[PDB]
Amino acid sequence: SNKYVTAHFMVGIVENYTVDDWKHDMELAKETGIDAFALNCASIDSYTDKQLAYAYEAAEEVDFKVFISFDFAYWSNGDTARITSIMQTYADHPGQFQYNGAALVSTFVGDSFDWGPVKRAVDHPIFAVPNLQDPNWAGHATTSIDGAFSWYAWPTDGGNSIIKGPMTTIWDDRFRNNLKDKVYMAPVSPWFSTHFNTKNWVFICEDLPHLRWQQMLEMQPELIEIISWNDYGESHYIGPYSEAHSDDGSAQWTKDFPHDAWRIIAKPYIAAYKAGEREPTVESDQLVYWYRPTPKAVTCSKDPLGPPNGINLLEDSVFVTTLLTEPATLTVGSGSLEFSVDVDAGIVTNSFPMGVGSQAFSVTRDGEEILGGDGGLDVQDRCDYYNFNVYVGSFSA
Ligand SMILES: OC[C@H]1O[C@H](O)[C@H](O)[C@@H](O)[C@@H]1O
Ligand SMILES: OC[C@H]1O[C@H](O)[C@H](O)[C@@H](O)[C@@H]1O
């Protein structure tokens, strides 16, 4: 009956992590109210066993928890013996995240992997919540599951066209209807932008870094997984940009693009979600802002990859989430443009037309500025490469 929030962590990019690197990520996750990392890992990485051992040790040492996400883009159904041996190592580890007295285990893809032989070979109870693609098959799953994890974190109609938002709960409600008694782990992602030779698209997210958390308070799923802590290559990271991870080419659009301020939004929503509350509690005045580096129609000078699929559906907007103890007035300067809007107490998002140039934010109450400053990135009217990630920043009273 207790509710918990987890975050997807890419073990595949941390070959060179130390225990101290893991501890740093875990401390930041704890400060946000996250309960555990899903350690997404691959059979093909020679460093998987080493880094799982470091993560479980770090979690035990800093009062955090972890569980394994077997990434079945790499793991295979023929790996049952190795998966079993890993669960024999970790299901009863004090740092292993437990749900209802059983060790949580999950996947990326891997719908066809049968958990029966694993569960029946491990003495400690296991709670299997794999990533499943079809809500209806989740209803009659043959693989000995205890719940399902959805990857439908972004607007989609089920096909391969990119569709406009705003995000809806249509897929969440389909999973929940089919799961009945079983548990549902809902995905929470702030953004999506990827730009590789093998994957080059955006999803239409916009106000998603706030809106999705509001949906979580409405929906009250049994578990949440944040997509993601550190998948720089898909731009949905809410964790820090770690110096020790291995760059895959995503540094091009991520190294200068902090996302840490999105944790300011997540923190009160996580507390409210765990408490069963329908609205967050604001403890101090804060502001979180985000925006892309250029207007969407700018043509690049030299990108060997074309523009990402879907960009025409984006808006040229600056997004601002205010976290307010009392009503106030929000003023935004975006290039030569200036806007203002009265905002209620609570957590509210407003979008503003993007202008090229410097960005400025200010919140005033009773004719006095309570917070404000300059955006950390000037919006530009040209680019070498297409970057549809966002810069995120904050101001706190
Ligand atoms: O974790 C599996 C694989 O994930 C990603 O493709 C990484 O770029 C690669 O280095 C890793 O082997
Ligand atoms: O829907 C987003 C997902 O699309 C594809 O399945 C990609 O393989 C995966 O990496 C991405 O997260």
Author numbering: 35 to 431
Give the exact sentences the study uses for this entry:
Complexes of AnGH71C with glucose and nigerotriose/nigerotetraose were obtained by soaking crystals with ligand and clearly revealed the binding cleft within the N-terminal (β/α)8-barrel domain. The two protein molecules of the glucose-soaked crystals each contain two glucose molecules located in the same position in the binding cleft, while each of the four protein molecules of the nigerotetraose-soaked crystals contain distinct combinations of nigerotriose and nigerotetraose occupying different subsites within the cleft. Crystals of the apo protein and glucose-soaked crystals were of the C121 space group with similar unit cell dimensions and contained 2 molecules in the asymmetric unit, while the nigerotetraose soak was determined in P1 containing 4 molecules in the asymmetric unit. Only small protein structural changes are observed upon ligand binding in AnGH71C with the most significant being the packing of the loop between β6 and α6 over the substrate along the +1 to +3 sites leading to interactions with Gly193 and Asn194.
